[PDB]
Design a protein around this ligand. Structure first.
Ligand code: HEM
Ligand SMILES: CCCCCCCCCCCCCCCC(=O)O
Ligand SMILES: [Cl-]
Length: 420
């Protein structure tokens, strides 16, 4: 199944609709698990979804990541030289040092009280006032992330830097926004490089064993220290993605307005299980990652389709999270599908549940921040569900576009907290 012509522009105009549009244009039936091949940026690109597509995408014998992401996205979103671009042993060594910070249960347990504290502070600012879920909880997450990482700055400096990360996250994916994203990337990179260099030269003392200290000590596979700008880029890769949970927190507010019986179950629970399952179904249901790219390292073959060395393989995330072959009633928002699960570690066993990637965190490229993200999103869900929180139901607060990346309600979701 091919679609003719170069569809680079159609990737921009369709956003999250691109993979299902191309499958339709190729003549596949709805719910087909057949690959579809198009041309993107001058080369073939084969879009796959579902469990067999996950296995291909994460097979590092045949897939590499270097060069797979277009730099206009990647250089702005993750920075040059980031772990996302690395392959083989250099990737393994870099990923081990970053997963040691984000994915270890002891460090996640350090983050939990910080994000609960910052979320409660944001929600307190809504009392009798006009709040914004996306802007205010993204800022709360960023404040928690900076304190968690040991980035110790005056309050106004932290807020300004988190503000830059929000502006970057809110703009990297459109033609109008990309110069704004690249400007923020340069300022943030300059800031993080100077902070890393300050720690390495003794001008700033990091808390022992904190994330900032471990990023200043970042080394490569030969044993040499990674240059200071790249280490600052990796420090951002352990704080900016936490700010980005604000997108999921916006959707969670929409979902609580739309599911009042689940909201009641959360408010009446003492276990946290409903809020956890609700947070997971927000990540399953709502669009965040549209798709993700890799490049073939050698000629191979997937379900009768030839894969040429150098071409892209694109894992369709929306189509995997919404596949009728992988999920019962995938168009239904239904937290019951996660109610039997207790932790994010247990949720990893669900093979098509890949909102932040698939396969294994330490041996592959899968996101090492899912425990952090579910912790932050769960804290948001619990606070948003409380009955004094009044979530606006107007069309600009509740609806969101599927043709723009990243997606969120246009208003950010307006909220207020009832006060006497
Ligand atoms: C806001 C929710 C988040 C989403 C939707 C998200 C999504 C993703 C995705 C799709 C990937 C790529 C997986 C792959 O290459 O196969 C990724 C990688 C990564 N994420 Fe996340 N992420 C989130 C939160 C976080 C958090 C909280 C952290 C850490 C604090 C984090 C750090 C990373 C890192 C370091 C990588 C690169 C891993 C690698 O290439 O080996 N992310 N993320
Ligand atoms: C022409 C487009 C091809 C593929 C485009 C993929 C867009 C990727 C966007 C999501 C990347 C995951 C990182 C999210 C969290 C963060 O880095 O702050
Ligand atoms: Cl299911």
């Amino acid at each position: 199944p091919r679609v003719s012509g170069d569809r680079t522009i159609q990737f921009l105009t369709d956003g999250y609709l691109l993979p299902s549009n191309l499958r339709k244009t190729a003549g596949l039936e709805p719910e087909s698990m057949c690959p579809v091949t198009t041309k993107l940026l001058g080369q073939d690109a084969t879009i796959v979804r579902g469990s067999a597509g996950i296995d291909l995408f994460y097979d590092e014998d045949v897939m590499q990541r270097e060069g797979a992401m277009p730099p206009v996205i990647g250089d702005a979103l993750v920075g040059k030289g980031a772990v996302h671009n690395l392959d083989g042993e250099e990737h393994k060594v870099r990923k081990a040092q970053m997963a040691a910070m984000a994915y270890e249960d002891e460090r996640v347990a350090e983050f939990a009280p910080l994000v609960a504290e910052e979320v409660e502070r944001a929600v307190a600012g809504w009392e009798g006032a006009q709040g914004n879920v996306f802007e205010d909880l993204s800022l709360a997450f960023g404040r928690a992330a900076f304190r968690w990482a040991g980035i110790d700055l005056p309050a106004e400096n932290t807020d300004e830097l988190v503000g830059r990360m929000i502006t970057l996250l809110d703009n990297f994916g459109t033609a109008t926004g990309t110069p704004k994203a690249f400007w923020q990337r340069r300022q943030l990179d300059n800031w993080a490089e100077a902070l890393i260099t300050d720690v390495r030269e003794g001008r700033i003392t990091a808390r022992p064993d904190c994330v900032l200290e471990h990023m200043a000590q970042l080394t490569d596979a030969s044993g040499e220290r990674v240059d200071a700008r790249t280490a600052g880029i990796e420090l951002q890769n352990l704080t900016r993605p936490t700010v980005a949970v604000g997108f999921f927190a916006s959707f969670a507010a929409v979902a609580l307005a739309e599911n009042p019986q689940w909201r009641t179950r959360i408010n009446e629970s003492e276990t946290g299980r409903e809020a956890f399952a609700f947070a997971q179904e927000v990540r399953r249901f709502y669009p965040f990652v549209p798709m993700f790219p890799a490049k073939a390292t050698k000629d191979t073959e997937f379900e009768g389709c030839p894969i040429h060395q150098g071409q892209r393989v694109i894992l369709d995330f929306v189509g995997t999270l919404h596949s009728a072959e992988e999920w019962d009633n995938p168009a239904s928002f239904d937290p019951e599908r996660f109610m039997a699960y207790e932790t994010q570690s247990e949720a990893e066993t669900i093979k098509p549940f890949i909102p932040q990637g698939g396969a294994d965190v330490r041996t592959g490229h899968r996101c090492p921040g899912e425990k952090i993200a579910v912790t932050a999103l769960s804290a948001a869900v619990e606070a948003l569900a409380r009955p004094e929180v009044r979530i606006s139901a107007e069309a600009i607060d509740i609806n969101y576009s599927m043709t723009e990346i990243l997606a969120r309600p246009k208003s950010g979701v307006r909220v207020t907290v009832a006060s006497s």
